[PDB]
Amino acid sequence: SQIPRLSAINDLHKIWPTVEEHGAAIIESFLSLDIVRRLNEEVDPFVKIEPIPAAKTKDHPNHVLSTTTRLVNVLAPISKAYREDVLNSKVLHRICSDAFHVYGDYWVLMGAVMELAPSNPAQPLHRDMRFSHPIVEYLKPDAPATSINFLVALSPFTAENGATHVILGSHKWQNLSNVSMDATVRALMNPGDALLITDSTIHCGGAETTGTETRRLLTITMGISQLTPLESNLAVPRPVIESLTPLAQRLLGWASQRSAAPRDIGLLTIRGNSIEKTMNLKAEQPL
Numbered sequence: 574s575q576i577p578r579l580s581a582i583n584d585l586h587k588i589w590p591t592v593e594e595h596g597a598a599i600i601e602s603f604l605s606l607d608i609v610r611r612l613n614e615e616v617d618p619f620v621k622i623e624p625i626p627a628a629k630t631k632d633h634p635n636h637v638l639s640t641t642t643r644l645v646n647v648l649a650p651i652s653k654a655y656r657e658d659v660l661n662s663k664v665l666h667r668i669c670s671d672a673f674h675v676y677g678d679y680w681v682l683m684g685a686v687m688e689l690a691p692s693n694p695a696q697p698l699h700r701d702m703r704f705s706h707p708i709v710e711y712l713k714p715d716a717p718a719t720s721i722n723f724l725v726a727l728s729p730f731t732a733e734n735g736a737t738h739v740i741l742g743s744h745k746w747q748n749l750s751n752v753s754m755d756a757t758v759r760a761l762m763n764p765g766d767a768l769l770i771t772d773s774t775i776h777c778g779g780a781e782t783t784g785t786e787t788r789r790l791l792t793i794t795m796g797i798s799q800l801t802p803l804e805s806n807l808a809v810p811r812p813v814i815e816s817l818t819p820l821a822q823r824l825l826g827w828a829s830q831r832s833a834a835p836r837d838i839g840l841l842t843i844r845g846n847s848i849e850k851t852m853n854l855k856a857e858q859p860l
């Protein structure tokens with residue numbers, strides 16, 4: 574039983590409902606080839622200069638990812654295609670709003686570009702958020718998902734190069750006795766395609782068996798504004814922040830946030846007013 578494939582043009586309303594039911598879905602043409610081209614162009618350097626996840630020069634090292642992994646967050650100042658294009662995506666926001674309406678506003682927990690080197694071993698099956706948000710394990714089982722992950726293929730995802738393994742229906746599992754690699758299906762995709770999984774879906778990156786292929790992805794974690802992001806955008810230049818849209822500014826934490834409570838008092842407010850009003854932050858300016 575393979576992962577459902579969907580359209581970013583025709584079947585838009587069916588995407589969240591699918592993930593909801595299966596835990597995963599592939600969105601073909603999630604990003605256009607032109608956008609994926611510029612994204613790669615722009616992040617290429619940073620991917621090569623990034624050190625090991627657990628580098629010694631880091632005060633917040635990551636001991637979970639492997640040495641063959643390279644990750645780059647805080648992509649707003651690096652890429653114009655991310656901050657203008659991806660962040661304002663109508664396919665993304667439709668899915669996000671459909672998924673997180675019960676809770677309210679959402680934002681970006683992380684937007685990272687990940688490049689796996691050749692001979693990169695498979696990861697162990699895991700659920701996201703368990704190394705940053707321990708509170709996600711104390712949620713009831715029927716609680717609607719608090720975060721969803723968009724893994725966008727920046728290059729081909731194949732069986733030889735390590736295409737993601739997913740266990741379907743695993744987001745509705747409490748008992749992890751059936752966790753095994755045999756129960757998984759693959760996510761084959763071309764550049765621009767996106768696998769969409771929730772925070773409770775058991776998945777993993779596969780093994781790179783060729784020795785020559787480099788696999789790259791753009792991973793965007795979206796979550797409710799009630800949870801703290803993994804990455805901070807506090808040091809992003811104001812000129813860059815002021816060149817964004819309001820929606821892009823609020824996704825990055827440069828805005829106040831609301832919740833779905835009927836008489837919501839807000840998040841990140843300053844004596845009744847917004848972050849944006851208080852600092853008189855403009856939008857859509859040039860850089």
Ligand SMILES: CN1C(=O)c2ccccc2NC(=O)/C1=C/c1ccc(C(F)(F)F)cc1
Pocket residue numbers: 635637638639644683685687695696697699700701702703704792794
């Ligand atoms: C700790 N971790 C991340 O670092 C991470 C990396 C990129 C984007 C989101 C993200 N948040 C997570 O939940 C996460 C899961 C996770 C990653 C790798 C392995 C490995 F071990 F397998 F490698 C296991 C578990």
Ligand SMILES: [Fe+3]
Pocket residue numbers: 699700701776
């Ligand atoms: Fe993961």
